[PDB]
Amino acid sequence: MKLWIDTDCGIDDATAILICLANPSIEIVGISCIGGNASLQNVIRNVNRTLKVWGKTDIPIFGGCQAPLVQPKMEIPHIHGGDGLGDINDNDFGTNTPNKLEKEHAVNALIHAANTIEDLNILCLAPLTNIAIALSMAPEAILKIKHFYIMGGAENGKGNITPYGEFNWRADPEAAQIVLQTYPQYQTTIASWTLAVFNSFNANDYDFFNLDGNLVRRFIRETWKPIIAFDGGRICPADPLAAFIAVYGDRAIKRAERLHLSMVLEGEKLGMSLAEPDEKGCLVVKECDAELFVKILRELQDHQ
Amino acid sequence: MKLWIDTDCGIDDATAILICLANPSIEIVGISCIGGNASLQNVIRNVNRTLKVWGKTDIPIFGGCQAPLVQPKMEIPHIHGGDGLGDINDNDFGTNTPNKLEKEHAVNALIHAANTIEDLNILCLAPLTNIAIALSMAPEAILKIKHFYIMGGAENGKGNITPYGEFNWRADPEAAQIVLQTYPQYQTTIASWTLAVFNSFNANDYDFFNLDGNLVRRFIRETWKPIIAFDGGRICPADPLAAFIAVYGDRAIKRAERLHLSMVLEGEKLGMSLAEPDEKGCLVVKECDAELFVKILRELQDHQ
Amino acid sequence: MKLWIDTDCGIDDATAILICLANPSIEIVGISCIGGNASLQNVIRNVNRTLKVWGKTDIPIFGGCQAPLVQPKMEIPHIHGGDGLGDINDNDFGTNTPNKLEKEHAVNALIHAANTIEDLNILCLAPLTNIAIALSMAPEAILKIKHFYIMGGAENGKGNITPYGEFNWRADPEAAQIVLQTYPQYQTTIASWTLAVFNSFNANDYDFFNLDGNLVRRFIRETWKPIIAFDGGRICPADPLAAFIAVYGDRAIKRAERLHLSMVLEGEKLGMSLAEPDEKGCLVVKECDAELFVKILRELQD
Amino acid sequence: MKLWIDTDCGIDDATAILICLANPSIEIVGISCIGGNASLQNVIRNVNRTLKVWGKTDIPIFGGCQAPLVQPKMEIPHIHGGDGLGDINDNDFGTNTPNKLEKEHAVNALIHAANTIEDLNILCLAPLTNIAIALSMAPEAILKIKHFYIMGGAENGKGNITPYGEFNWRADPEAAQIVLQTYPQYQTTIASWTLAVFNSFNANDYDFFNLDGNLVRRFIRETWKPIIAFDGGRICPADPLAAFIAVYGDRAIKRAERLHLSMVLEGEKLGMSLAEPDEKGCLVVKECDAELFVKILRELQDHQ
Numbered sequence A, B, D: 001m002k003l004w005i006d007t008d009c010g011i012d013d014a015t016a017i018l019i020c021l022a023n024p025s026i027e028i029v030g031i032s033c034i035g036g037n038a039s040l041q042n043v044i045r046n047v048n049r050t051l052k053v054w055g056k057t058d059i060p061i062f063g064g065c066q067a068p069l070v071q072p073k074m075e076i077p078h079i080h081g082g083d084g085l086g087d088i089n090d091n092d093f094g095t096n097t098p099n100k101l102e103k104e105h106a107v108n109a110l111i112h113a114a115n116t117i118e119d120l121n122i123l124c125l126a127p128l129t130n131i132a133i134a135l136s137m138a139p140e141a142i143l144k145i146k147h148f149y150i151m152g153g154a155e156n157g158k159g160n161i162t163p164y165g166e167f168n169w170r171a172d173p174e175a176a177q178i179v180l181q182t183y184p185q186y187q188t189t190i191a192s193w194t195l196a197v198f199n200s201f202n203a204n205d206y207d208f209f210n211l212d213g214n215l216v217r218r219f220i221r222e223t224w225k226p227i228i229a230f231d232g233g234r235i236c237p238a239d240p241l242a243a244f245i246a247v248y249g250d251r252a253i254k255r256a257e258r259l260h261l262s263m264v265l266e267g268e269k270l271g272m273s274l275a276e277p278d279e280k281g282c283l284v285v286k287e288c289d290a291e292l293f294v295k296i297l298r299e300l301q302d303h304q
Numbered sequence C: 001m002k003l004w005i006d007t008d009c010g011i012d013d014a015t016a017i018l019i020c021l022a023n024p025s026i027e028i029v030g031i032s033c034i035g036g037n038a039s040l041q042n043v044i045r046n047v048n049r050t051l052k053v054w055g056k057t058d059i060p061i062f063g064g065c066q067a068p069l070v071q072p073k074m075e076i077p078h079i080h081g082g083d084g085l086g087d088i089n090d091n092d093f094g095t096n097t098p099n100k101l102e103k104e105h106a107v108n109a110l111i112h113a114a115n116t117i118e119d120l121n122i123l124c125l126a127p128l129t130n131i132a133i134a135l136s137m138a139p140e141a142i143l144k145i146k147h148f149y150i151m152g153g154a155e156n157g158k159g160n161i162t163p164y165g166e167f168n169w170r171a172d173p174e175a176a177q178i179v180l181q182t183y184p185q186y187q188t189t190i191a192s193w194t195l196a197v198f199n200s201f202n203a204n205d206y207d208f209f210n211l212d213g214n215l216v217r218r219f220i221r222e223t224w225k226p227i228i229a230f231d232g233g234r235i236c237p238a239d240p241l242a243a244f245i246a247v248y249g250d251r252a253i254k255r256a257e258r259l260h261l262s263m264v265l266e267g268e269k270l271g272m273s274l275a276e277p278d279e280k281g282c283l284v285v286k287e288c289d290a291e292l293f294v295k296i297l298r299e300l301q302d
Ligand SMILES: Fc1ccc(NC2=NCCN2)cc1
Pocket: A012, A079, A160, A161, A162, A167, A227, A230, A231, A236, A237, A238, A239
């Protein structure tokens, strides 16, 4: 399985990537970066942090766009920390080493990969700016991609950054609409914020993000600590669940519903995902196998 | 004057290109195509027709985006004909020969042009889709460009009414917004739909699009037939006016007002623009030297 | 005058409907729907919207065919907005209410009406798929219709207005050929797309599609707003004119020619029509009384 | 097996209906007629003739359309005789009694049967007008039909009424095209004129259309006479092969290919059936079991 990752690497993105890194059936062919949770510069460094701590700084990292498509920067709390990665200390991980960053823009580099790589998959964990620009430029190339796995939206209209809108799709609703109207929704699987709260864990009862012993455990514990707090003591593994579904396929999904999705692009409900039952729409995952989810997360943290 | 042209080669674009060809002080460094008046494939063919009729194939032609960013296509075959250039017969003009199309995407080619041509100017004759994408991927590059001349938008007219039929910004209001908020409006000059509406010619009184005796005159007359008839016998020379202004500068412009410019992206007036008197705004041309404009139109149709 | 209307209720269609509703000598006995400007479902909604805005829900609405006869689905357009009616908000019109739709297929209902209602006329505002199938299924019935008023076709040659603005006949050339070769052309009057551009109006000069004060004016102004932005600031009355001719007859017509019409069903000109002077042919209108046209449009908005 | 039959009451049609009547597992739920070989008027008569000769006029008969969709009706060089059924004499058969015919139009009847009869199959023996219109009016209804069995086309490109076209699909090529593009070709089985010429028989060398003893053999022998003379002493059993395949199915198919078919709708090859290899196209039966075929053709003729 050939996988591309577009990310605004904050805390839960980083774990998503660890999930992809750990499974040997997954070849990460590139990582593209975009400014969501934090600035593009911070994202790029945080992807570097994650690869280093895992010990595979082999994957090319590409910088993408610098702002949403047309939408402004708005006003956020630093939910993922000032650095976008929980404000961790690099000395606690040995990652005060130079950062890698390819030359090509991520849009150009994505288009090239969708042309020159067969059965390519993309896992989107971020506002969809990079992807939407690639579909605007070379839709024929991007359409060669085999499947889209996207963390975004909330099909029950219950958002997080907004009462109505999930963060990725409120941050660049135009970009989301572009994807939902240019890449076949039938070949699109969605892990929504509705899913991430439904499959959430009380962090007092589950300890799988709360270990020391090795660097992977330390990284996961320290990065996840402020957002677990922000989410009210719950673990809401939005991006990891999307990585989970990407890597493990039908085994990852307990229940899904084919849903045609479309974006609200004005009014107080800007960024809300409208849902309509349609057998050629998106596979909107409704329930994951939570035990297989915690299993693979523990296994990637295993000493062995 | 080094000049890039971005066009959706329709009928008045073609005349506008002819204006740039006729003036020996302009070097056209490239022409990017976007699907506006007609599909991107037709625009590319029509730019080719225009260059062959003139006799200069030394100008690279690049293909751009396949659609507007978010909105639907809005092609106008009832106004510019099915092929977007008035359905002329290539066998009548000797333009039934292979078409020229560079391999690089217009967006990438524009960025490289902005990064490698000193004193590059851009004349934009179409929905700003291509330009918006270039500003998102490489704003440092596009910002190197000395000046934007843009045909688009519709501001307050004579009597505080804005006239009805603006096309370019209406057709991709998100692209126009991106250009207006990313490229400095002070280095932007506007040839607006208001201008064109108030510099229209009764075709019965003016014959300069109804001459004969050489190829260029055949080309102008045949290509303007459908739009003149569709305009009730009236010549509304939007893109020629813009080319007039970018080419002949201060001799083209009688009156102008500096105005800050804004797209409405939400609610009932989506696709209209906002205009506030502002000294760092766009130089929005209010009146032209129409006598000189007809002169330059007649001259490029001369037997020399 | 008893009248059946066939529509892909989009913007001009709705105003054309309103022309018929506004004249008390016209009895609309039924409106059939076909998906052209927009999907069938959107057309049904939009006919309902137009009836509600006027105040006469007493007219049965029938659903018809979904696609062209032979031509493959080339994807629903959006010249008339996403919903086919300029994307208007029903909360501003009080039309967020259940929709009416009869159970009979439009093809069967029209055949029934043609069999039972004396001196039935038809106003055809859309691709002719419904009429063609009714003609093909029950010619002896449809041939009873007193007269055919058809919006469609364009002149191709002997003019400067592109034939490529034409939609209804291009959208289903086979249906148009069936009507033209089965229903008598002498009993047919044509309001062409050429007519709609020739008798068009500069909206920067005419404000008759830009009033308020009441519901009809708001409907007319807001529906036509997007299509005037398309069409470059111009009002191109394609369907209203057809309704104008159907309802006001010789008063509506300035000039007209009898032309035998046929479709080009193959080659680069597929969808175009051949016209040949012939006095057993279609009454093809070349010029309308525009001053009376505007008067008629302002009155129904009064 | 529940079967609807569409035909024009022709020579080889009648034998095919006899094949279905004579099988005790076939429930003929209706017979629709269409003006193919002869007038709809004669087709209705001939269908009545066939059912009386067999002895079960318990099956409803529906009149359908009177002409092709677009094409004119053709000059018939009497392939099937002036009356369509070989110009046979009613007194030689006792079929000079009142006809039966339902009131409902065949289009509406077929649609109602598709909407209300479980596992409905259709045997199309005729120009496809009725089916095309049913498809155009109520696709949701007609798609419920379990399978289509159709006599039409010639993947050879070698027709009969035309060098390039088989009679049924030449006579209404639009109708044929509508069926092939609207009803799943995968759920369609074609018995082409190629097939009928492949599995032909010299009448000089074969007897089974030349036997006497009852009314049935009198019927087949006397109806088939003028037309096997027409084919020059050979028996090409186009519609009987179609009934054979439909009633027997895989018990009579020796060899078949999956071919996507489409119509030529213009030029000299008007009515030609184009064929591409396509695993989800029509099963185009290339050869049947002539032995099993002539067997059941005898079983139905042995004295009842
Ligand atoms: F507006 C927001 C509110 C909460 C969160 N929390 C969260 N996102 C991923 C994992 N946990 C994000 C945005």
